[model samples]
Target: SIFRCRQCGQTISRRDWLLPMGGDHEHVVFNPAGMIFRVWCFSLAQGLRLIGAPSGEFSWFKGYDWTIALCGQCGSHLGWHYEGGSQPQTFFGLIKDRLAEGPA
Candidate 1:
């Protein structure tokens, strides 16, 4: 997620991003050498392990078995990447057999 100056509206996607969990982790993707935007994942990383991965097992990096994302600017949600099904828009394989639950 990239934070843009409301006045300038600058847009940039950084490599290393940070979270405001009031805590820290050993591994994190922070901003590159040239960037001025703050990135944040609005929803969850149902498939973060694969977010910036070159190519490998996403679950290995995420720790948890599920992950997903949401847009910061707006309240829009993003899908996850799985082992079998594919994301026609981004070339990702959607992990099958998972239930998409929501508020009852």
Candidate 2:
């Protein structure tokens, strides 16, 4: 199944999801309601508009850069675009709960 935005039904990710690297791939992220959830990393994404400049210092980033990624249709907090230092290695950290199941 494909993942989509819950509010607007906008396509958010390309694939169903990337397999977690190991048993501890879950990332703890906070939302506006002071709620926390886990996000899964993927090799790519879609329908996300970057919110601001990339920032660093997240432990999960391991010294890489990251920018907030928001849903294009409904402006919902999705995840982030994480990049390696100097290299081109990158991916989208997508919230597992924010995506709706569907056929791509």
Candidate 3:
């Protein structure tokens, strides 16, 4: 199994030996409440995958690909971009949890 240091949000995609499929896959590595970036969303997009970011030389939202930025220090997800068309897609979900403290 993989364990986060709780200090950095780095990940280990592979291990020396293999483990059960779902038993070792990590989830929610970073927080996403205070992140911001530019991305395009597109139609005909569906999958069971998380966000994927791109590499760059400038940080002024200068990229032509999908990207996801996070707080590696705390695994906090800021947000991600998708291939949006002239109009963007809409998604809906339920709010299941929250923290009572504002420190999170």
Candidate 4:
């Protein structure tokens, strides 16, 4: 599968980027602000640009700091980049609504 940015049709990632966590690659998470997000875990996101300093404050995943992830082509909010995990040191928590997936 190929995931594309909804705003710009920019290819963001492929199935090869998918990363399993607790046996699943997709997750439904909420932030401290109580906003729910349906996210997919990915080892890499080629169409994303990260901004802001990584912060551990209110991190959804323990021990990981998160930074904003945006669409590289259109600068739309995509999700977040997480660092400090034990196995995969870094990963993307991309918003499902912000991406469209299709056949590879």
> Which prediction has the highest TM-score against the true structure?
4
Candidate models: Cα lDDT each: 0.28, 0.74, 0.27, 0.89
Q: TM-scores across all candidates?
A: 0.19, 0.77, 0.20, 0.92
> How many clashes in each candidate?
16, 0, 16, 0
lDDT of 3 by residue, 1-104 (tens): 32222334233121222222123212222224543332221122112133464433222222233345343345444333333222332211101121011111
Off by over 4 Å in 4: none
Model 4 Cα lDDT, one tens digit per residue, 1-90: 899998999999888889987688889988878899998999888878889999999886777999999998899999999998788899
Q: Model 1, residue 29: displacement in angstroms?
A: 4.3
In angstroms, the error of model 4 at 47 is: 2.0
Task: TM-score winner between 3 and 4, please give it.
Answer: 4
Q: Give candidate 2's root-mean-square deviation (CA, Å).
A: 3.2
lDDT of 3: 0.27
Go through the candidates in order and give the C-alpha RMSD of each one to the true structure. 13.7, 3.2, 14.8, 1.2
How close to the true structure is residue 19 of candidate 3, measured as C-alpha lDDT? 23
User: Which 10-residue span in candidate 2 carries the lowest summed lDDT?
Assistant: 16-25
Score candidate 1 by lDDT: 0.28
lDDT of 2: 0.74
- The C-alpha stretches of model 1 lying farther than 4 A from their native spots are 1-23, 29-56, 60-62, 72-104
lDDT of 1 by residue, 13-66 (tens): 221332222233222332235423222322123222333323334432232332
